[PDB]
Amino acid sequence: QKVTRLSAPVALAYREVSTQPRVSTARDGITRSGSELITTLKKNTDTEPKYTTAVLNPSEPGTFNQLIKEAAQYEKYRFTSLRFRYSPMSPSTTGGKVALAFDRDAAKPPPNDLASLYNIEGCVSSVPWTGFILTVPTDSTDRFVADGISDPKLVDFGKLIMATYGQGAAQLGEVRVEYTVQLKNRTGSTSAQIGDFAGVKDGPRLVSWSKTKGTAGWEHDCHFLGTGNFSLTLFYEKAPVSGLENADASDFSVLGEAAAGSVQWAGVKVAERGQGVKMVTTEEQPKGKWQALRI
Amino acid sequence: GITRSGSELITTLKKNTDTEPKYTTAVLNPSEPGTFNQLIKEAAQYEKYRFTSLRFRYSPMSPSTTGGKVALAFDRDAAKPPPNDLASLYNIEGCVSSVPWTGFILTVPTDSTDRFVADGISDPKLVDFGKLIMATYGQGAAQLGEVRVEYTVQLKNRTGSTSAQIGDFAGVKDGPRLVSWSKTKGTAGWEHDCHFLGTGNFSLTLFYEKAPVSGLENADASDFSVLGEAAAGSVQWAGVKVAERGQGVKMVTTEEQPKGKWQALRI
Amino acid sequence: QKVTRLSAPVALAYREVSTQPRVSTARDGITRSGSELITTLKKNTDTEPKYTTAVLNPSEPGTFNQLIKEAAQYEKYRFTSLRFRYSPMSPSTTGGKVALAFDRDAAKPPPNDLASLYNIEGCVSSVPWTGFILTVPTDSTDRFVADGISDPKLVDFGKLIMATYGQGAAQLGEVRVEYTVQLKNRTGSTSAQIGDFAGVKDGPRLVSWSKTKGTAGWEHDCHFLGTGNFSLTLFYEKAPVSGLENADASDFSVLGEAAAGSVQWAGVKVAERGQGVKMVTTEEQPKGKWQALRI
Amino acid sequence: GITRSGSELITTLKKNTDTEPKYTTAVLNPSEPGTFNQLIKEAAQYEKYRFTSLRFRYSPMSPSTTGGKVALAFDRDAAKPPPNDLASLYNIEGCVSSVPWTGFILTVPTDSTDRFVADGISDPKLVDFGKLIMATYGQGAAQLGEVRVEYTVQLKNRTGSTSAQIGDFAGVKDGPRLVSWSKTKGTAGWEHDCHFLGTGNFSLTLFYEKAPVSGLENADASDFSVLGEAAAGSVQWAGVKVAERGQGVKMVTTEEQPKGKWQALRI
Amino acid sequence: CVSSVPWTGFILTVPTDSTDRFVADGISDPKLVDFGKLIMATYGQGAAQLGEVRVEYTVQLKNRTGSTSAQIGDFAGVKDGPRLVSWSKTKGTAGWEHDCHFLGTGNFSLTLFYEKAPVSGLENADASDFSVLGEAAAGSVQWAGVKVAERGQGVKMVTTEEQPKGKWQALRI
Amino acid sequence: GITRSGSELITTLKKNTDTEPKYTTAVLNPSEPGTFNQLIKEAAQYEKYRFTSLRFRYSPMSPSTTGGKVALAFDRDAAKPPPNDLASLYNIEGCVSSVPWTGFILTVPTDSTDRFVADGISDPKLVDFGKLIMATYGQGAAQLGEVRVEYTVQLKNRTGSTSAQIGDFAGVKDGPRLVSWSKTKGTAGWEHDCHFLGTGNFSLTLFYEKAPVSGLENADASDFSVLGEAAAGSVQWAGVKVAERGQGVKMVTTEEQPKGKWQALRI
């Protein structure tokens, strides 16, 4: 029965705990179950949404900081369960919407506009003073994770999205990812990821998430192939131009010099796949070194 | 053996109108005042314990017109960097944060090994379970709430002793030469240092001569009680209630070390 | 089940009535049951509580204005039931705490500090937008009421306490005392209480609650031995120095001259046992008269 | 409720090479340090007790080449003049004195009523059983022995609080307004007073300005430690080890009360 | 107990206990954190590349935590930085000659550190196999594979006098 | 597992004709000779133990014409400063001091955890229960008595190994590279250092070249036996009988370290 009576309380709120994990034989596979909390959102007291599109793949920390530690021993997966809840922790004296719907094709520009968003399944935004959930029709093909690069389409379903458009004031809420995975084929390896340039050449030769291109006129390139919040840490020698700037990026944290021989660090929070950050040092490629951990 | 039961109120929290939590991780051991100001006075006669009951409640004393979260979950391994990030936090049992306009509780699976308290130092792992944590991330405005520690302890083996304590500075040097609980460092640009090595509620009492700058201020501290001048030659007093180990308090007097004297009793 | 869902309403409130009383044979005793409303509290938009500690004894009006009228015929009691509720009559748009826990040893300084408070049973403070109760393990010894003075320990359990620390704005709530007493031994007598000084000496010779000492350098003393809100009324002749001043006191109401031969009045609201008030008239003791009713 | 067990060593005795005993009567209550320096630290959180076990032994550490007696028997009514005379003593249970070259014990029929400790004053009878006693009459030479109190207590009702400590004089008046153990009276003809209300070894530390007469002298006292000037504007310190309740120490500075400040921590 | 000849197939087993011991997100003490190291000797003269072994096991990993890496540990001219999971402690012995250590045991993959490529680098002493494919560097890059022996075996550089440098990361493997 | 039973005589005490005790605190672990000179020879083949029986008796071998006390009580937490003061001592179980003219015993509640001995270092808490203590305060004259350790051990897990011993200095450096019991430090202003890490009676034998300053002197030591030159190129020998762990002996030869060689056998 909807009808009559409704209590839109001043305040509503939920109480979520701390998911402790569960697992299976050999047959030719292992498994999992969710419990992650994928970044939030932040007001929007504006008239056009604004998205944080976050990418989904067994290893893309910006979407799994606790499970990207058991895919360094396998390669391929599943999904059987996975949903995102807008926990709800902010009174009703605040409002708007909090779009939230996934698109298999986890990579492509979010639109720019709503209708655009409000036309791509997922479905389900609601107001910020309530508790909603989100679910996804998961398939059944033995897909591979990225010990790189590839193509953002043959290796992972598609990124997630989230927008929220409002103006009444607050720090809306939070979400995670309800899931259960299948990690076939026994492998084992990986890291940063550490990737050095040798005056003649480079070196990404130990698990990816970014490709480092440069655009001539030295101004350079510092990229991604994966999606989530990260912990950079790295590289150095002739601390030139700059460093660690960013452009199609999420939050940046640099606690370095410049360096002309120094050290550096940053935390990204990306958007949809492939967002970029860059230095500035001369003309033609040799440098120093770096390591990019997902987190 | 003897026993106990909780009733402490371990420091609060303070807004966070920001998008990344921020933690006060407080350490747990029969003697770490920064987590027991009323029971760190009956472990100076024993050495080893229990726990059979202990939970932390977010008392709830702040309207709903305020919101966010107030993470709060313990990790046996009471020592190691909190992360930096949530998920990180939101992946370590404890579990349980809720909003600030409600009343929540927290509980911990307690073991059963005859562990020893710290008449020091040691190693932060073989002497105490692990520290507690608490974060809160929000932006709507308030002074959230408060918590304590529901518990019941076991203090075997009859011992007896401890302190920090009278420790004087002699113009050339100092003098801590009669049982500790605090180390007195200074940070140049005289602004100074007045510290702890122990944990519980205390009764300060002390020190003096050129009553300068200030005195008895405090920072990573529990309740303060100063009933002094300043003094430029006076007398002073305070009661701490600490948090986890090593919380600090300080004076302010010049430039380069000589002064007067002090004595720090535990209580 | 705690979990999921919670409604911290804008407003919550209760509806209490008007306790009409109930009573037993001879055996060697009578009985009772509560219904009193012991003083409130008042904001505290500050960071340190602040207490109204109120004393408990069959006759201490500042804790019984309707039962201190049937202990003028007995001497000794019981308690079998007694609890204090924070009625709850103030919306949630307000908050903080309202400590409220009794300590047998009904007399001794409240602390100064919380932890101090938050370490003494009672237990139970909650926020001001809710309805809480409080209860006390009552004993079983034939204790005597005060047709005075005594010692605050052998005559009454201990005072009650109440603090509240907050800053969001309101006139919190109210409480009483759920109880059931035992008044053995048939006696009968009392009043003020009226206590006159005769130029050579005084006169407290008709039921107490205060002891009148003076501190030389005439500045004087006007005291308590009991606890609750009172109605003073009294004394006079050479309206000197002052009169009716107060120090470790609760609310004061003076509607007198000074008097140099006048009349006076005040209402106290004490704190824990023994709070003091005073006059000011010369040097060495003779005066006039007074009467102190509990209320 | 909680509980305990003894281990204290309550003051000794000292020769008596005389023909009339001479008593040190020491009072018993969960909080009376002059009879508990290690347990008067866990009754600041409760109020009421028990006793189930408690006996005093004359440890025996002095050769037989010495002799006399060492009376030692408790009297519920822990307060009233000791007599003056033996028979008087030798008529009040307890019973049991023996010679100083042997090892004796003493025991007490303990009751069973929920009695309250003193967050004061009261009446010495409704709050504590009664004081203990000890005499010794002899003449052959020695520093007899020592004793303690074998016990096991019950501390009901959860409370929590107390103290005595920083206490300043303001030219017009003073200031003890933050937990006691001593009362500072003066006896005219300025010669002064520096006292106790509590019992145990302490760490003084304090007070100052016109460093007169003296300072820190002592009389019905235990060990003294002064590491000050005099001061005429200085700083000072001492460690007491008292005897039974209320032992006194004093300064010497003029005529009529204003001074400086001090703080007395128990330890 | 149990050595045998190299032309046969033997096994080895260990009485395992039952106490909730902690792994090393460092350092500690090699005794309260792990049972004890294993051993293996072989004494012969007739010629061959004997055989191989593993570790038959079944573990219990309580308490849900989560974190770690190298392990990456940088020195900041004023101070250092091991602040992300250990296996070695880097002390120096004055007269600069230095220290490059372990707190853990197994074959590793070093990889790291740099700036003023001095003295040397990557030398080793109470060590297992070394693999350095660096300069020296006076600003370069380096690498090595250890195979240790029992706990705490050491390796070292050589660069001046008083501590500031560059950075490094030590992965276990 | 294997087992054992006591019979050791752990160092004595020596007068104290003074008013503050004074302690010899001796540490307990299957291998700490300063507490086992006959059983620290069968723990070089195992690692872990028990205790099921262990008590210390004050044998009593000194007339009553002497007196005082001989405190003697163990504290699990076998490591931490003894106090400084009695009450402090007289508050830590053990219990039991008596006079020197009598025969007393001491006993300890022993546990039941598979603890490990020290093929080092560690932490003094996770490897051994705690040290023992002994004080005696008196003034009447004598060489009080002696004690041992009544025990029965459990040495699980079959191991086997250990030592300290021959340790040479090579002009550039030294050489202890074949089992210890002593560490040889020097204190500048050449006056030097010749030490222990183990406890029991030993047979030194050793070292040489420029027979300088002296040699084989001793300080916190037990009996010395030197049957050498000086040597300026000679040979030497001594028998120690130590006290508690780490007692020291020394030479005297110049300025800056190179010498000759030595070997220290335990015995």
Total residues belonging to chain C? 295
Whether the CA torsion F122, F125, F129, F130 is positive or negative: it is positive
Cα–Cα distance for residue pair B105/B93, rounded to 1 Å: 14
Q: Are B188 and B126 members of one domain?
A: no
Q: Does residue F86 sit in helix, strand or coil?
A: helix
Residue A28, CA distances (Å) to A25, A184, B194 in order? 8, 6, 61
Q: Does residue A54 sit in helix, strand or coil?
A: strand
Chain B: partners with 3+ C-beta pairs within 8 Å: A, C, D, E, F
**CB atoms B166 and D3 under 8 Å:** no
Please state the separation of Cα B35 from the chain's center in Å. Answer: 5
Residue F123, CA distances (Å) to F24, F34, F91 in order? 21, 18, 25
Tell which residue, E125, E123, E124, E144, has the closest CA to residue E133. E144
Contacts of E28 in chain B (CB under 8 A): 123, 125
Contacts of E125 in chain F (CB under 8 A): none
Best mutation target, C1, C2, C7, C92, to test chain A (most A CBs within 10 A): C7
Cα–Cα distance for residue pair D123/D116, rounded to 1 Å: 11
Contacts of E29 in chain B (CB under 8 A): 123
Cα–Cα distance for residue pair F239/F216, rounded to 1 Å: 11
Cα–Cα distance for residue pair C147/C60, rounded to 1 Å: 10
**CB atoms E29 and F122 under 8 Å:** yes
C70 burial level (CB within 10 Å; 0-12, 13-18, 19+): middle
Tell which residue, E92, E93, E88, E116, has the closest CA to residue E104. E88
Tell which residue, F258, F261, F256, F259, has the closest CA to residue F188. F256
Q: Are C24 and C96 members of one domain?
A: yes
Contacts of C8 in chain A (CB under 8 A): 9-11, 13
Q: Does residue D151 sit in helix, strand or coil?
A: coil
Structure tokens at B131: 């520290």
Tell which residue, B82, B75, B93, has the closest CA to residue B130. B75
- Write the DSSP symbol of residue B88: H
Place of tokens 């049951």: C33
**CB atoms E29 and F116 under 8 Å:** no
- Interchain contact D38–F (C-beta under 8 A): yes
Considering only CB atoms, B75 lies closest to which of E29, E32, E65, namely E65
Which amino acid makes up residue C286? P
Q: Are B115 and B84 members of one domain?
A: yes
**CA triple A87-A92-A98, angle to 5 deg:** 50
Q: How many of the other CB atoms lie within 10 Å of CB of D175? A: 14
Contacts of A291 in chain E (CB under 8 A): 72, 169
Stretch (H or E) spanning A117: helix A114-117
Stretch (H or E) spanning E144: strand E143-144
Find the closest chain A residue to C91 by CA distance: A10
Q: Could you list the residue range(s) of the whole structural domain that residue E153 is in? A: 68-173
Please state the separation of Cα B198 from the chain's center in Å. Answer: 9
**CB atoms C115 and B143 under 8 Å:** no
Range list of H helices, chain F:
86-89
Place of tokens 């313990």: B74
**CB atoms C105 and D161 under 8 Å:** no
Structure tokens at F156: 């699980």
Query: Which residues make Cβ contacts (< 8 Å) with residue A122, sequence separation at least 6?
Result: A99, A100, A101, A102, A103, A134, A161
Provide the CATH number for the domain around residue A110.
Answer: 2.60.120.20
Tell which residue, D121, D129, D254, D253, has the closest CA to residue D183. D121
Place of tokens 């004709």: F17
Stretch (H or E) spanning A232: strand A231-233
Best mutation target, A10, A12, A85, to test chain C (most C CBs within 10 A): A10
**CB atoms D265 and B203 under 8 Å:** yes
Residue E21, CA distances (Å) to A20, A151, E61, F127 in order? 20, 44, 10, 15
Q: How many CA atoms lie within 13 A of F203 on its CB side?
A: 2
Tell which residue, D26, D116, D16, D117, has the closest CA to residue D69. D16
Q: How many of the other CB atoms lie within 10 Å of CB of E29? A: 19
Total residues belonging to chain D? 267
Find the closest chain E residue to A21 by CA distance: E64
Please tell me what resolution, in angstroms, this structure has: 11.5
Cα–Cα distance for residue pair C37/C40, rounded to 1 Å: 9
Which amino acid makes up residue A159? K
Q: Does residue D58 sit in helix, strand or coil?
A: strand
Structure tokens at A10: 């001043």
- For chains B and E, CB pairs below 8 A equal 27
- For chains E and F, CB pairs below 8 A equal 12
Q: What is the largest CA-CA distance in chain C?
A: 75
Chain E: partners with 3+ C-beta pairs within 8 Å: A, B, F
Q: Would you give the end-to-end CA distance of chain B in angstroms?
A: 22
Cα–Cα distance for residue pair A264/A269, rounded to 1 Å: 17
Asked if D145 and D62 touch (Cβ cutoff 8 Å), the reply is yes
Cα–Cα distance for residue pair B243/B152, rounded to 1 Å: 19
Q: How many CA atoms lie within 13 A of F195 on its CB side?
A: 14
Cα–Cα distance for residue pair F187/F196, rounded to 1 Å: 16
Burial code (b: 16+ CB inside 10 Å, e: under 16) for D43-77 equals bbbbbbbbbebbebbbbbbbbbebebbbbbbbbee
Structure tokens at B149: 């520690």
Q: Does residue E65 sit in helix, strand or coil?
A: coil
- Write the DSSP symbol of residue F138: -
Structure tokens at A173: 């809420």
Please state the separation of Cα C75 from the chain's center in Å. Answer: 19
Which amino acid makes up residue E65? T
Q: Phi, psi (5° rounding) for residue B87?
A: -25, -45
Cα–Cα distance for residue pair B36/C38, rounded to 1 Å: 34
Structure tokens at F217: 């002197």
Cα–Cα distance for residue pair A138/A123, rounded to 1 Å: 16
Considering only CB atoms, E72 lies closest to which of A69, A196, A233, namely A233
Q: Phi, psi (5° rounding) for residue B152?
A: -155, 115
Cα–Cα distance for residue pair D1/D3, rounded to 1 Å: 7
- Write the DSSP symbol of residue E51: -
Cα–Cα distance for residue pair E130/E110, rounded to 1 Å: 9
Domain end call among D130, D161, D192: D161
Tell which residue, C48, C270, C89, C50, has the closest CA to residue C175. C89
Q: Are C49 and C121 members of one domain?
A: yes
Q: Phi, psi (5° rounding) for residue A122?
A: 75, -70
Q: Does residue A116 sit in helix, strand or coil?
A: helix
Q: Are B120 and B14 members of one domain?
A: yes
Range list of H helices, chain B:
86-89
Residue A184, CA distances (Å) to A56, A70, A136 in order? 18, 12, 22
Secondary structure E strands in chain B: 203-205, 217-218, 237-238, 249-250, 263-265
Q: Phi, psi (5° rounding) for residue D89?
A: -75, -45
Find the closest chain B residue to A172 by CA distance: B68
**CB atoms A171 and B86 under 8 Å:** no
Q: Are C185 and C212 members of one domain?
A: no
Contacts 24+ apart (CB under 8 A), E53-60: E53/E12
Rounded-to-10 torsion of CA F211, F214, F216, F220 = -150
Tell which residue, D42, D241, D235, D9, has the closest CA to residue B266. D42
Q: Does residue D94 sit in helix, strand or coil?
A: coil
Considering only CB atoms, C3 lies closest to which of A11, A12, A15, namely A15
Provide the CATH number for the domain around residue A289.
Answer: 2.60.40.3420
Stretch (H or E) spanning D88: helix D86-89
- Write the DSSP symbol of residue A231: E
**CB atoms B93 and E63 under 8 Å:** yes
- Interchain contact D223–B (C-beta under 8 A): no
Domain end call among D161, D191, D220: D161
DSSP β-bridge partners for residue A54: A160
**CB atoms D158 and C121 under 8 Å:** yes
**CB atoms B88 and E65 under 8 Å:** no
F112 burial level (CB within 10 Å; 0-12, 13-18, 19+): exposed
Asked if A273 and A106 touch (Cβ cutoff 8 Å), the reply is yes
DSSP percent split of chain B into helix, strand, coil, nearest 5:
0, 10, 85
Q: Are C12 and C125 members of one domain?
A: yes
Cα–Cα distance for residue pair E142/A198, rounded to 1 Å: 11
Cα–Cα distance for residue pair B105/B148, rounded to 1 Å: 10
D109 burial level (CB within 10 Å; 0-12, 13-18, 19+): exposed
- Interchain contact E29–F (C-beta under 8 A): yes
Place of tokens 């308090």: B249
Asked if A242 and A258 touch (Cβ cutoff 8 Å), the reply is yes
Best mutation target, D50, D224, D263, to test chain B (most B CBs within 10 A): D263
- Interchain contact B190–C (C-beta under 8 A): no
- Interchain contact B81–E (C-beta under 8 A): yes
Cα–Cα distance for residue pair F233/F212, rounded to 1 Å: 9
Structure tokens at F124: 């003094």
Residue C83, CA distances (Å) to B107, C268, F89 in order? 29, 24, 47
Cα–Cα distance for residue pair C282/C285, rounded to 1 Å: 7
Structure tokens at F152: 């029965």
Considering only CB atoms, E66 lies closest to which of B76, B92, B126, namely B92
| E–D contact: 3+ Cβ pairs < 8 A | no
Range list of H helices, B191-243:
none
Cα–Cα distance for residue pair F263/B50, rounded to 1 Å: 49
Cα–Cα distance for residue pair A147/A206, rounded to 1 Å: 8
The bridge status of strand E155-156 relative to strand E123-124 is antiparallel
Cα–Cα distance for residue pair D32/D46, rounded to 1 Å: 15
Structure tokens at E125: 């002493």
Place of tokens 């019984």: C64
Q: Phi, psi (5° rounding) for residue A269?
A: -165, 95
Structure tokens at A98: 């909090």
Whether the CA torsion B79, B85, B88, B93 is positive or negative: it is positive
Task: Using only the alpha carbons of chain A, give its radius of gyration.
Answer: 21
Query: What DSSP assignment string belongs to A82-94?
Result: -B--B---S-TTS
DSSP β-bridge partners for residue A194: A291
Cα–Cα distance for residue pair D100/D13, rounded to 1 Å: 11
Q: Phi, psi (5° rounding) for residue B42?
A: -135, 35
- State how far residue B157 is from chain F, nearest Cα, in angstroms: 7
Strand order in the sheet with D263-265: D237-238, D203-205, D263-265
Strand order in the sheet with A265-266: A265-266, A231-233, A291-293
| B–D contact: 3+ Cβ pairs < 8 A | yes
**CB atoms A12 and C3 under 8 Å:** no
| Total domains present in chain A | 2
Q: Would you give the end-to-end CA distance of chain A in angstroms?
A: 46
**CA triple F230-F233-F234, angle to 5 deg:** 50
Best mutation target, B41, B158, B179, B181, to test chain F (most F CBs within 10 A): B158
**CB atoms F123 and B120 under 8 Å:** no
Q: Are D35 and D141 members of one domain?
A: yes
Contacts of E80 in chain A (CB under 8 A): none
Cα–Cα distance for residue pair D91/D133, rounded to 1 Å: 13
Cα–Cα distance for residue pair B47/B69, rounded to 1 Å: 37
Q: Are B130 and B252 members of one domain?
A: no
Q: Are B147 and B188 members of one domain?
A: no
Tell which residue, B24, B41, B29, has the closest CA to residue B149. B29
Per residue, what are the HEC states of chain C? CCCCCECCCCCCCCCCCCCCCCCCCCECECCCCCCCCCCCCCCCCCCCCCECCECCCCCCCCCCCCCCCCCCCECCECCCECECCECCCCCCCCCCCCCCCCCCCCCCCCCCCHHHHCCCCCCCCCCCCCCECCECCCCCCCECCCCCCCCCCCCCCCCECCECCCCCCCCCCCCCCCCECCCCCECCCCCCCECCCECCECCCCCCCCCCCCCCCCCCCCCCCCCCCECEEECCCCCCCCCCCEECCCCCCCCCCCCCCCCCCEECCECCCCCCCEECCCCCCCCCCCCEEECC
Q: How many of the other CB atoms lie within 10 Å of CB of D39? A: 23
Q: Are D121 and D191 members of one domain?
A: no
Find the closest chain C residue to B65 by CA distance: C93
**CB atoms A91 and B138 under 8 Å:** no
Asked if E88 and E78 touch (Cβ cutoff 8 Å), the reply is no
Stretch (H or E) spanning D217: strand D217-218
Which amino acid makes up residue B205? T
- Interchain contact A8–C (C-beta under 8 A): no
Place of tokens 């009409």: C20
Query: Which residues make Cβ contacts (< 8 Å) with residue A215, sequence separation at least 6?
Result: A221
Backbone φ/ψ region at B211: left (φ over 0), alpha (ψ -120 to 50), beta: beta
Residue D102, CA distances (Å) to B197, D61, D139, F37 in order? 45, 8, 17, 36
Considering only CB atoms, D61 lies closest to which of F67, F90, F91, namely F67
Structure tokens at B228: 């002094």
Domain end call among B111, B146, B161: B161
Query: Which residues make Cβ contacts (< 8 Å) with residue F41, sequence separation at least 6?
Result: none
Asked if C121 and D157 touch (Cβ cutoff 8 Å), the reply is yes
Q: Does residue B231 sit in helix, strand or coil?
A: coil
Q: Are F128 and F177 members of one domain?
A: no
**CB atoms B91 and E28 under 8 Å:** no
Asked if B249 and B184 touch (Cβ cutoff 8 Å), the reply is no
Q: How many CA atoms lie within 13 A of E34 on its CB side?
A: 16
